[PDB]
RNA sequence: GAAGCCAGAGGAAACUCUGGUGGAGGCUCGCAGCGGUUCUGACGUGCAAAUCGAUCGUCAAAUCUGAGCAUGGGGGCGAAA
RNA sequence: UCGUGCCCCGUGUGGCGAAAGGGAAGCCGGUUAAUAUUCCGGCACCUGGAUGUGGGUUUUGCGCGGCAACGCAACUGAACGCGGAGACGACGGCGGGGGCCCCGGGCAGAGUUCUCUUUUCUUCUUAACGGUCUAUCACCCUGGAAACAGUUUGUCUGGAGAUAGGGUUUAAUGGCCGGAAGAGCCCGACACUUCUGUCGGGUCCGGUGCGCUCUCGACGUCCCUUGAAAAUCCGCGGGAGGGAAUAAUUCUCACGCCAGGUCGUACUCAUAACCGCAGCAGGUCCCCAAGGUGAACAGCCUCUGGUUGAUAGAACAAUGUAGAUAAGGGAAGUCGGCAAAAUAGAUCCGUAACUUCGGGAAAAGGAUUGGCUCUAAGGGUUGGUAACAACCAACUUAGAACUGGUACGGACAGGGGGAAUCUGACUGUCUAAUUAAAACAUAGCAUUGCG
């Protein structure tokens, strides 16, 4: 009783690997008499041939590890294998900061809080690395507006 | 294929919609001639081709 | 495949000589009905909302153009 | 359970043994003969061409090794 | 507010007195958890019995039929009927308990 | 366009 | 290869038709000296040399 | 971390300094690939008429590589043994 | 009638040569024991040839509109010319799109269930071909800008016309629609000696990104290196001819008719289908490339998919091969520290002589690294001191307390370092099968011959 052909045909019919095909060991004679794909489909319908479910692979532990690192665990100096630039590129950080600062300057110019000359000056300062972040840029804008208002009041 | 369809028409009064051809591994040629829907391949094989 | 958005254009396509078959697809989950006519080059379809205009158009097709409602399962 | 190397076959794909079901329900204490599992438990040219196809698949048409001699001796 | 009806029909094992409907209702009462910790049935979740081995659950929150099937399988595992009883969604929001297929021997 | 297609058109006219 | 010339395929066709043992009625002829096919070829024994 | 570029502090200017940006180099560590330094290495009628293990050189190029073609022995080809 | 004659152009006049170059056109589902982008079903496309209908143009003969970029279903075009496509390097970052990976909810199914786990896992798909609305660059109109402005991660653009406002367009693997749910997939209930199936339900809605892969686009760098050709196709210049109302039409518009020949197509592509004398641990050109740890297609473990094949059983002597440990001393061993051990990731402090000023340099020498609970910082969208509200989002960085300890880059992974001398400038190359080197080559230098 050889069922290599039957296992290959059942794998082709069920659309799975040959390691996922289950042949009923109590009807090996009936499976042997099944010699075509139609007979294989009839045995699948009758339940003599079953596709086994997939071997278990869970991502649970990866999910609690992701949540723990999101909270801030497993981030110490003994958990790092790459350089600081390798984990987080400072060029990428500078690109994100420049895009944030330019977006804020464009929004302020569109809203009308600053004019074109102050916009150009702050654009070149942000390019020349005067501002670390958006809060610093907003504080400098407010301080420049306040000193301009003081100069206008003096004049 | 053009010669094959003429040969079939002259021999068995067979009209074919299309003909596929292959060359077998032993060196001969095998031809699959698909008939018109108005004729029956079972009837033709039973009467003329003798293939029962 | 082509979609026609005009009833009279679908009627003229049905009166065209090349039209060999017409069929009706009823979608109840969407509430629509599709009239599909098979010409030589293109399959022309008209989409309608479910109404009595579908049966009026069914009457409006020529009787020589044979029409079928599609089954639930496309058995061979 | 052997979930490390393989998945468990679903229970709906395996027929349950009658005596094993009766035994488990008998440990559970229900009156099996009273509740009745016995009834619930389960146990022409076309013809000529079909015969020709069956014969063609079963027996080879010719035997070039042994078609030259006919007597059994 | 939205209202959801779930039916758990154990008519055949209840008539066979294999599955205890009152014990299953109790199991639902101290196993259904609302807002992350148990004992929040309140007015949101209502479990009652009609008869003929049927339990109805009224849900005003997003209580799922998958969760009710999960709790039914947990109760079957507790009462050692997991290998012999099966929960099948025969209809929309209706889960039937039934025997697995049996062969004579 | 191409000479073959133009020849086809003028042959259609000639026929 | 799968890509093959018609001449090559014709010669492999002749090789396939030549790959056979002798008929058994050859051995019972009177004065027969042939006992086996002495030019039999196998795909893993000797090459066709094409 | 080279040119180029931005900002700030000076300097009459030229330029000086600082912080950035940038991403060059027959640059470098190193995986594949390519090669073949060392071992009282394995093997020595071997798996092998040159193989196997660890280790080592190189790795953005004078890098590796296929197919088609060219050069044919008193010849070719040779970063030259 | 034509097979006979008359002209016109004449500079030029062959073939072979790539299953990885250029190139006309096919996708999906199903089917066999073995073939399938080839068979079957559905739905298309290309080329060549004829030939009608509808529509278009025309008595202002060979269209109309928009200032323009240009648009529209058509919208004459011979000789002779012009142009484009074919048709093109390597590398670097950035942006868009498809696919893959990750997260959440919902339906159905499966598993776990001592306890816990509203739980973990699986299906949730949409091809070619078309319609329609959009998509960087670029171009057009108004206007004339220094108190220079716009703007990229990267400094370019602008009186040779910027910002701004309004548009036109190359480009889809983008949204919707047709194809097309009737398919495929998942689940359930009956029938079922076979023959064989039959009937229901669903196939949904979101998010995220220095992620992987492919492709497209705008940039930038390098060259004493500038990174194929031809077949084929198209537009233009030109105006030769042909052209209307017994209607005409030489319309690149839509629909309609016919045909598409020959040859290959199985299988392996390798620890058994090739070569090596073999079913030989060797050699042999490519495409796809999941999850976790981690900087990482490193090493280790797992999913899909494949194997469990390489003579077996018993015992544990010497000597071996491979892997290890060893008190005290620490090279006393040996020709010779051969071999092994020792160092190693990341953060921080710090780093000498010499030097062609570029390096040396990871010089050297030191301080730290687990787990848990927290804090702080770094953002996006929408909405008239908005310096405010609402909603949403993921990864880094710093600081603090507590706590286990023999050890915290807990396995894996992974520089020993320094003082000198000779030597070749360096990167590179060679004696396939005993020598990789002060050998060869190299840049630089010099000389010679030749108008």
TrEMBL record, chain A:
Residues annotated as domain Large ribosomal subunit protein eL19: 2-145
Superkingdom, taxonomy of origin: Eukaryota
Signal peptide: none
Family in the record: Belongs to the eukaryotic ribosomal protein eL19 family.
Protein name from the UniProt record: Ribosomal protein L19
Organism: Chaetomium thermophilum (strain DSM 1495 / CBS 144.50 / IMI 039719)
Residue numbers of the full-length protein present here: 2708 to 2862 of 2898
TrEMBL record, chain B:
Protein name (Swiss-Prot/TrEMBL): 60S ribosomal protein L25-like protein
Lineage: Eukaryota, Fungi, Dikarya, Ascomycota, Pezizomycotina
Family: Belongs to the universal ribosomal protein uL23 family.
Signal peptide per UniProt: none
Automatic annotation (TrEMBL), chain E:
Coverage span on the entire protein: 16 to 120 of 127
Domain of life from the UniProt record: Eukaryota
GO cellular component annotations of the record: cytoplasm; ribonucleoprotein complex; ribosome
One GO process term, biological-process aspect: cytoplasmic translation
Similarity annotation: Belongs to the eukaryotic ribosomal protein eL22 family.
GO MF term (any one): structural constituent of ribosome
UniProt protein name: 60S ribosomal protein L22-like protein
Native source species: Chaetomium thermophilum (strain DSM 1495 / CBS 144.50 / IMI 039719)
Keywords: Ribonucleoprotein, Ribosomal protein
Spans traversing the lipid bilayer: none
From TrEMBL, chain G:
MF term (GO), any: structural constituent of ribosome
DNA repair listed as a keyword: no
GO annotation terms (biological process): translation
InterPro entries: Ribosomal_eL39, Ribosomal_eL39_dom_sf
Gene3D superfamilies: Ribosomal protein L39e (1.10.1620.10)
Domain of life: Eukaryota
UniProt KW keywords: Ribonucleoprotein, Ribosomal protein
Gene Ontology CC terms: cytosolic large ribosomal subunit; preribosome
Pfam families named in the record: Ribosomal_L39
HAMAP family the record matches: Ribosomal_eL39
UniProt family annotation: Belongs to the eukaryotic ribosomal protein eL39 family.
Name used for this protein in its record: Large ribosomal subunit protein eL39
